[model samples]
Target chain A: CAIRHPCHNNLMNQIRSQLAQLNGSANALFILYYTAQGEPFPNNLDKLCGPNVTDFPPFHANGTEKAKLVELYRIVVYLGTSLGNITRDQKILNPSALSLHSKLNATADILRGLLSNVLCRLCSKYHVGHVDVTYGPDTSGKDVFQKKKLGCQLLGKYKQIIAVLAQAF
Target chain B: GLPPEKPKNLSCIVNEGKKMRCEWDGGRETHLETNFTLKSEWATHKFADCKAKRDTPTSCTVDYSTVYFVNIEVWVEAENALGKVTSDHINFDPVYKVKPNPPHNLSVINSEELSSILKLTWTNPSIKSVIILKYNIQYRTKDASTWSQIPPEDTASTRSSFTVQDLKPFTEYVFRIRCMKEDGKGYWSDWSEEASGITYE
Candidate 1:
């Protein structure tokens, strides 16, 4: 029954919004990785961007990809929360669970560029390098999703989240 | 074909009870560059434009205001090279539509009033200056899929605490609460984070 629209609901919307706010900043990615696992060096700092991010090693691939990891983690947490909501009533009373939820939202704010940047990167990368993935010749949209090099990464990420979510619920 | 039947069911949500966003059904594929503009009048005399979702003309986000109890005007406009269309405008008080953030700091304790009753309490949503909020509490067994609401109570009561009687003691249960304005004008907030408690044996 949960399969009807697994990643297509508010969970995705929330995750996507957070991803957007998290788009270009390595700090957004850095702080998010730490926060999702509930680890920020200072433990209690207001903004999770700019100079505060320098303590960690910077992303080699640059702004966008760095934060997709943040987005990926966010997607899993959201799926878990959604499942937790339906399967476990009174579950929120757990203080740490509530604390983690707050951290996730605040962290996603800086990812203002998630959706567009992600799509743009995907679309552009597809055309570059004279590449052809999956289908014949230049390939097509649906087939592009099969390649681990591009769209499959998104689908792959989603599939992994759902697998755990499936058993959790 | 008909400039893609004028946007229908145009609506807005203070997303997360915090964001101001609007979306609508565009009927069908226009195969044209259909433009959508979300115009709003909340804090000023003139309507302001907001950033929109990419290629998703049917969705957009507007500026959210911290001001309390003000009426806002909202409508969507759609246009293509063929023609233009407008949705019927709606006017509503932000307080009536404002959603409370989820209740927080929820806890359950053995009732001092009655050994049989379990006391449930939580930090009220942060809508103090915005408006007075009433709460709705729901609970169910860990193995149960259905939720039972507090009897004879609407979410509009301004209490941060509640108690449940007539439960099977010693069994664990889950509890959650959502809040809304006392007058019931705005949307009911989503449930607070989930919590659990065991009845006294």
Candidate 2:
């Protein structure tokens, strides 16, 4: 239920003052998702979302929620090439907790399939007479444990996507 | 046809045991004298005989270590009546002194790597070694055009350093040294200042 527009509230206050002058620098994001050609996910989900994706604004915010969070940070850098991480005390392949648990389980299943395709395209493009929009089950199991504690806070924001996928290995 | 006759003023005198006497004034009254006897090679008889003005006392006697060949004669007869007229023969050899033409500051050390090694100084005009006798350093390199002799194991007996070894790196050499005694080599002293070097690439 959000619709304030003074040019979208001065463009969200100039995107929060340019994300606070791009916080600690190094930034890159390039979403483009677009589905539907017999979609089952794979209509070149923005070319499998890559060639760009860094701190993508604490997990999506617009461009269709950043093309579903760059297809969940490209399935957490492809399941962090197999759950690898934890070294020194060895447990090998812990590539930063498997790239932050495959980028928080592919961004919590692309935010639960983009909240059920934005509530079925807003109940078929605004003809919405009673769009309840429910993919429910968390009828208070503490909101299903707070959506798995926000998927562990999206795996701690996929540790900034495994520090930007350990710079391409 | 009578206006050409004005030559007569010859004079010489050395007498008293070295004799060389000679005189001539023969002018207005024609009077000449003569009397030679110097030996070493021609100059004997002819004690005295004058005509216009000459009074020879003793004509020759020089022998400073042999090298002589002199001849002199005088005459002037004008007996009026177109029957007497003489005057010819005035030869000379006058060799005096000459032996100091060998002392031109022969230098050589501009730097063929200091002319192949070191202390090769020179400039002996008169320290009297009786005209120098040892100093022939000669060098060559501008792609060699001759000048070789720099031996004595490449010089330096007591000085004029000459260690020149293997040298080829950056060459342009050319040296010349001279001064040898026994009265022989001594006129090659004008090239030392032309020394050159480039051998340290």
Candidate 3:
């Protein structure tokens, strides 16, 4: 069914675009939060230290789309949890981070539901193999500036992953 | 002035696919400056209070990002010069509590292929991809007070356009549309603003 389902392809495109916008919004809000601290946004760190597109797996090999979808799920889950940690660690009451944190978590959960629907309808039975997943360092110990840069780097990673998966679809 | 009555029927919803809105029945008028504070929490943590403004005394919209699939507890607090009272808490998953935005940009076109038919088109709500939706469409002649509806069964799936047949030629008609989640969960969106067009002669 995965070979010929138009709906499957359509939903994959939807998830691709949704992740792109979410990454852009996270970057915007990350900048807005720190810029309000009166420090110039480390535009240099954001631009120069960003994740490269090649850092993510290409998923071009045959029969790897399932792994690609699984990897997408794992990335969003990690991103959502990282956002939660960042929001919880804010010493002051920061409404912006708190709300977006909730939003990202909620949306990630929604996307997982959509992804699971596709997985369930696929023709293949469960495979014994595992997809390799990785993440940047934890956000808990970082200072505000360190955390901001970490957020930038991880979201950059997210953007590239989405791009690679978009191509897979 | 008497003490405030207990805020009753505390409920919350996500409208326009954007923010969480909670409103309560503030039982009786205290005839004084009564303030309502909406409180939310999860089993492990608490959220900032959502204070109801003077202009909107019964409701408050929480400005936080809403997490779906997780149950959150919410309640309202009423305070006046006389006393402070709290409402019973209501718990729900924000995803299941949504009221989507109405479909919009409704337009009607004359079907040159058939003089007696009119084609209606509109954009789905911004939550189009987030949720599947079914629609309710109604139309009436320009001077008619009652509306003729396309059978709910006929429009019981996600789609952007529909054609109505057997209409008199060269007559102006007004059309309006609304939608709700496809699985019969959640509230119907408010009707879109009406659009009108004439059938081909």
Candidate 4:
């Protein structure tokens, strides 16, 4: 006999599907932004997007997997905060950036709540380390192109991380 | 002679198979000839201006194909002899801002195979090709006050027609339909005018 939360399978499926859609939109938004600017976006995602989650521990609700997921989760939350400010200051209200900003914010909230539910219900000890990753480099006092570039890279990496983690489930 | 006040309540919509049309309240009369221009752009690009037509001062049709999942900022600028003022800007993806035309030509036929079933057929909105859509189908006995709806899960995909089961025999039934984005992310079109048919005796 196996024990499982009735909603766990359904919830996991929802998150995976949602992540897939988010990844697609993220890349599409990036391309649209660069195309609108009349420039080709650099294809150096590996160098720009920070560390790879695929190299981290396996996916699970406890131990090292929990730590990795938390780090990924925090990065997402960081992006939400930084994107909101950057867009407001830089006036990047075009459909591509704004919609991406909205989805990141929502996905962060959903992931946070889902993790909390899973940890509390299933794990006996669910502690995790904080992330010190540098995200959203200071574009303050920078011109529009510089600000847009930083925002684009941050999203590019965000999409990379999400795409990797989503596959583990 | 007063300066033009900023426009108010500016909004836009992309009807099925139609160009994007934006309308706004032109504020208080300037009492002078006022020229209105509809401005649209992404963060890094700008499209041609849509000058408000002479007869329709508060609305204009965008002279470009509607792009989805990308945000564009739109606003109205009013210039008159006294002064010029720009309306507050609205930024959004047109995919989320659409108000599709309703399903049409609804015809209901009694199923000869079953006395209690009626088959419904209709044309999808012209925007059908641009976005995937789902429908809302409702029917009511001609003399009844309440409408009976088919389960949404069953009609959750795009289709030209549906077979409604467990209906009453030899009775007049009226049906209507509406639709929106399949993922339920956008606005529902207005319900089509009702059509009726009598079930087999």
- The models' CA-based lDDT, in order, is 0.51, 0.33, 0.67, 0.66
Cα lDDT tens digits, model 3, A24-47, are 454554454444333444556556
Of the candidates numbered 1 and 2, which has the greater DockQ value?
1
* Candidate 1 CAPRI grade: incorrect
Off by over 4 Å in 2: A1-169, B1-63, B66-127, B131-169, B179-201
Between candidates 1 and 4, the lDDT winner: 4
What is the per-residue lDDT of model 1 for residues A21-77, given as tens digits with 9 covering 90 to 100? 233232433343334334332353333222321112222223353354333333433
Please report the candidate that would top TM-score against the real structure: 3
Report each candidate's C-alpha RMSD, comma-separated, in the order given: 18.0, 51.3, 10.6, 14.2
Q: Runs in model 4 with CA error above 4 Å?
A: A1-169, B109-112, B142-157, B182-195
Model 2, B2-111: lDDT tens per residue? 32233344444332123344444433532332222221211222324433322433222233321111223333333432224434434332212112222233343435
lDDT of 3 at B21: 89
Candidate 1 global lDDT: 0.51
Give residue A20's error in model 1 in angstroms.
36
lDDT of 1 at A70: 38
Model 2 CAPRI quality: incorrect
> Which candidate would rank higher by TM-score, 3 or 4?
3
Between which residue pairs do clashes occur in model 4?
Answer: A95-B70, A95-B71, A96-B71
- Quote model 1's TM-score: 0.50
